[PDB]
Structure formats: structure tokens, C-alpha cells
Symmetry: C3
Subunit: 250 residues, 3 copies
């Protein structure tokens, strides 16, 4: 018995690994019928990323037994750089032994590449992210959000996000002076705030600017905040699932 998943849009998988490799190097892929789930904290335990790819998003998905694949994300991103952006990527793992096979098929079907990747024995054991609801939920174009985080990183190392019914404000402050970006509430080009209470948290731009490498996956990003609680930045992945990143304040 074996795991095998075929993905006609191989570029999603290349984008997902770009969005993770800077933050994590090693992660356990939790493969099952429901699909692929991945959850890891950054080397420093400051942030946690959680990937969901549903079975239905794949063109073909067979999972005979659940597996816990430990994968070096650096290696896998390297192996994915040998996939053309228009290739059909297929992942295959046989329930015994320790190797993931990647197969990149050329649309023409004259070139077929076949990589075998050494898995890791990494003993993940990771917590439960429950459903939860937050004081302010900002929804905004991801490129705007990326740009905001890049700009303010030129002023300071920390950004102070302040949210109110009408608008969210991002601020940084350093040797050059102070910056202050104030978004107001407005195929995905407008800002939307759903807020129950107001909130003002401060985060490190270094981490937010890792999160924004997910930007190619999604035209929108969702920020959820509540006091003394990690920020959730979420990128929906087409009709497959999501990528969330949690960052603790201060």
C-alpha cells in the first residue's frame, strides 16, 4: 500500500515550499485520507505555521495508511526547483522505508523527471490548533500587506498594529523617524474589518516579512487579533486549503 497524490498545478506546491523554507527547515507531513496537514514552529519557537491541503484539491489522491513523513523542507524546495512551473507534480510514498518520490511530467509528456528524496526521522508531536474567534479581523489585499510590512521594516524592527471599527493602523519608529500607515475600511482589492473590541499589538517585522513570502498563493490575507494572543495571518490556497502563521506579540 502507498500514498500517491497528483497535482496538475505543480506551481502551488513550489509556492507552498517557498513560503515555508525560510521559516522552517524540517517538518512532518501528516498524510491521510482527508489530505495533507503540516504544522511546525520556527527554529526559535516564536512562530508556528500550519499548512492544510485537502484531498479534493488534488487531481488524484490515494492514501492507504496514514503516514507521518518527516521531510527536510530545504531539500524539498531544491528538488522542486527542478520542476517547471507548468509541470504536473506527483508525490508518491510507499508505506514502508524512507523515501518520497517526486515526479514532474512535462505537459508535452516527452520529458518526465523523477526525484527520490531521503525522508527524515523527525519526531514531530505537535499541538492542537482549536477553532477560535478573535477581537479584530482585518481582511486585506495581500500585496498591500506585504508592502506595508516592507516599508515599515525600513523605519523600525517592530510594527504596532492598532485596530478600530473603521480602520487599522500600522506604525514603526526608529533612527530615521516614525512611519504610520492608516488603512480605512473600503477579484480582491478592498479592506474589511470585523471587530468586536479594539486591539493594539506589536509584532516583529522580521517574522511578518517571512509570512509575506506566501503572498503568491493568495490575492488576500486575513489578520486576526486579540489581546495577549498570537496574531494569525492567513493565506487561502485556491480550492486546496490554507497556510496560517501565528506570531506572538511583543
Amino acid at each position: 500500500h502507498m500514498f500517491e497524490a497528483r497535482l496538475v498545478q505543480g506551481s502551488i506546491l513550489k509556492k507552498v515550499l517557498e513560503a515555508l523554507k525560510d521559516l522552517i527547515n524540517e517538518a512532518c507531513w501528516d498524510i491521510s485520507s482527508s489530505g495533507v496537514n503540516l504544522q511546525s514552529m520556527d527554529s526559535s519557537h516564536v512562530s508556528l505555521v500550519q499548512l492544510t491541503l485537502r484531498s479534493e484539491g488534488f487531481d488524484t489522491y490515494r492514501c492507504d495508511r496514514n503516514l507521518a513523513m518527516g521531510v527536510n523542507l530545504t531539500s524539498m524546495s531544491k528538488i522542486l526547483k527542478c520542476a517547471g512551473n507548468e509541470d504536473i507534480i506527483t508525490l508518491r510514498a510507499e508505506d514502508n522505508a524512507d523515501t518520497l518520490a517526486l515526479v514532474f511530467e512535462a505537459p508535452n509528456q516527452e520529458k518526465v523527471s523523477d526525484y527520490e528524496m531521503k525522508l527524515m526521522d523527525l519526531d514531530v508531536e505537535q499541538l492542537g490548533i482549536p477553532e477560535q474567534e478573535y477581537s479584530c479581523v482585518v481582511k486585506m489585499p495581500s500585496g498591500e500587506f506585504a508592502r506595508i510590512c516592507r516599508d515599515l521594516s525600513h523605519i523600525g524592527d517592530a510594527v504596532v498594529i492598532s485596530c478600530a471599527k473603521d480602520g487599522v493602523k500600522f506604525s514603526a519608529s526608529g533612527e530615521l523617524g516614525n512611519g504610520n500607515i492608516k488603512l480605512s475600511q473600503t477579484e480582491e482589492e478592498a479592506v474589511t474589518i470585523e471587530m468586536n473590541e479594539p486591539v493594539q499589538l506589536t509584532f516583529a517585522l522580521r517574522y511578518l516579512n517571512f509570512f509575506t513570502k506566501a503572498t503568491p498563493l493568495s490575492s488576500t490575507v486575513t489578520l486576526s487579533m486579540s489581546a495577549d494572543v498570537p496574531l494569525v495571518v492567513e493565506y487561502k490556497i485556491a480550492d486546496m486549503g490554507h497556510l496560517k502563521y501565528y506570531l506572538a506579540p511583543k
Copy 2:
């Protein structure tokens, strides 16, 4: 208060890109006629002079003349947080030692506000009189930038020789000797010459000057014996940027 609104914020970004490599600190001389800036490079080899007329701005209010001392490095960094289509507004209030930059998104949902510490600085030069020059070459700026880049791969100095018909640029080094000869033709070369001239300049400086290239599709070289070269970039309905380089 001083306040100037500029709908084409990308000019101001470009102006600061063209200066920051050459100067780090400069006193903006703000008045009703407009903004003037004039300053030598760190080594006093070259002098740059910026003119932005009041009428080039979309709004310009100058209650009292000021001398704003601004760190160009800091201001360029702050301008990198402006989108190329943003409306930039500069605002400085009598008394305060802080320049406000405000970048407004065309959509008008995102508005950025930066506040920049000013420096205490005085309007560091007067000079650069009106004169008429022996040879005035007018040429596509990208051609001129390319010429200065190419010859910098041969030598450290370029010898510019001008005659009625044409100007010639030459350099010489370890690899050999290069020689670009332009003939008289914002896509063509034009020479207005009263006398001929042959001056030698350092390419290191000319290659700073060419960072102004984005401001203008043409550049004007004015030359006369024993006198600094003027390289001028006219700015889209606002004014100019001139750089003076002494021969050698």
C-alpha cells in the same frame, strides 16, 4: 507653514536617488518661487544644484522662507515607502524641526505619514553664475550614461573633445584605448559650439551624475576651457538638476 503637494511623487523619489549617492546632507532653500538646493559632494570635487519651481507643484504654500537641513540618506529611505503612483506632500511648520511626508494612495484608502527629523544647516552655496559656454552638446541621456559606463571599463578618465560636427569621448588603460565619436544628428545629438574644447574628467563622478537619467530623456553637456563641465537634467515641468565637475 510650508506645504507642497506633488501628484507625480515619482519625481521626488527620482530626485533623491540622483542626489543621495553624491550628497548625504543638504539644506533645502524653500521659498515662494520654490525649492532650491545646492551642495558639493563630500570631497568638494563637484557641486549639484536642484531647482523645483513652485508652479511644478500641484499646491505650493510658503508662508516664510526656510532653510531645511535634511539628511538625504534618511529622506531617500523614507521615499522608498512611497508608491510610484502616490501623491507626495511635504509639510513643514514654522518652529518645528521635523519634515512631514505624506503619501496618499490613488484609491485614498491607504495614507502613509512619515515624520523626519531635520538637521541644523545653512544654505551652503551661492555660486554658479550665468554664463555662455564654448560647446553645448545635447544628447539622449541613456546614450550619455552608456558612454560613461563603457569607458569606465577602459579607464578612469574620459577626454571629451568637441568640434562643430561632433563630440568624441576617449579613455585609455590596461586593456587598451576606447573612443566613442558621436556626430550631430530627445533621440538625436545637437552641438552648439562657438569655439572647440578638449577637457578631461573623472568617470567616477560622471557615473554618479548619470543616476539622474530617469528624470530626463535628454542631457545637456556645457563646456569651456579651464571651467567646470555642467551636466544638466531638465525635470518634467519643474526645473532642473545640474552637476558641475571641474576638469583635470
Copy 3:
């Protein structure tokens, strides 16, 4: 004097990009038939052979044969001062040690003139005589460049295996094993008399693929116990061949 005018100067810029990484010094063999150049890499693993026929030039005059010794690094730097649409003219006078390059702008206002110091260097890489090979693979050059780049991320050597239907490229290292299998098919063409399996160093193949801009195809010719020939044809002038020993 020697004098050759080339309306498509970008070929000569490309030819020097394709050689400078592999060789730094080479003797240009100028003659009536045209320009020939032949030289081994610094470590004598590989030999490159350039052919530019007299008929490919827009003008070609060679009064007597010369052996111009040229620093390819210097000449590439000088060629970087040529616009991609310029007319390049090479001129050498029999008893001078200087090559003149002249770049004319299509407009003909901008004319650049460079003079380049020649070197006094011998000439013999012994070349390779023409032969017929067991497997000849013909394929898009950018595919071949990509293949060589990809597998260089897995291993340092590639094992090229050819059969009537298809060729396979394989590499193997710390990350694991890769394996690209092309089938005969813009398109891949195999002419094979016998099957062939040789192993080459990717370090070298990846220098060879700097010729890629010269040609939309590349030809690999192989036979046992004999160097691989990778050939790039040059637009109506000739070719660039690189031989790598297994």
C-alpha cells in the same frame, strides 16, 4: 591586413560569452576560409572549437593567414561596449600586435573604436578529426541547459544513457537521486547505431550551456570510450563544439 565586418555583432558577443568562462587565452586562426579557434580549458578536461566561415561575414578580407593570440576576458569586456544591434568590424594589420574593434551604431552617429593588445601565444590544441558517432541526440538547447542545471543540484556527475527511443540523464547525491528521461518527439531526435552510456561531469556541461543563446538546438554525439561532442550551430556562420571526455 585582415578585416571582417559582421552586421549581427551580437553573435560575436555571444561567442565570447560562451568561451570566456572556459578559456582565457586563445589563438584566433584567421584565414581565407575564415576564423577558427581551438583550445583546451585550463585543466585540459575539455576542448572547444569555434568555426566562423568567411561567407557568414558581411565583408571578409584576409591577405595572409594570421595567428592572433587574444585574451578572451579582455575581448569580452571590450565587446560589452558594443550595442546588441551594432555592426562589429575586426581589423588587424599583419605586422602589428593590436586588434581593432569598431562598433557602428545602425543610425551611424555613434561610432566606437577599440584597440586591443594581442598576446604572443602558440596555437595547438590538437583538434579532433571528423567522425561518425554511435548515438546522436538532437534537442532544444534550453531543455538541455535546464537538464544540466537541475541535475547539478542533485550530483556532480550525470550518466547519459541512450537507446533507439530515448535518452536518460541521471544524477545521485546527498538529497537523493534524479532521473530525466526524454523520449523521441522544439523536439528531440535520436539517431543511434548502437546504445551508449557515458558519465560526465556536470561542472563542464554547465559551462558548455553558456553557448545556449547561439542556438535554439544542441546536438550531443556519443560513442564508447570517446569524448562527447556538444555542438551549437551559429546562424549561417558555423559552429561551436565542446568535447568532454567521459
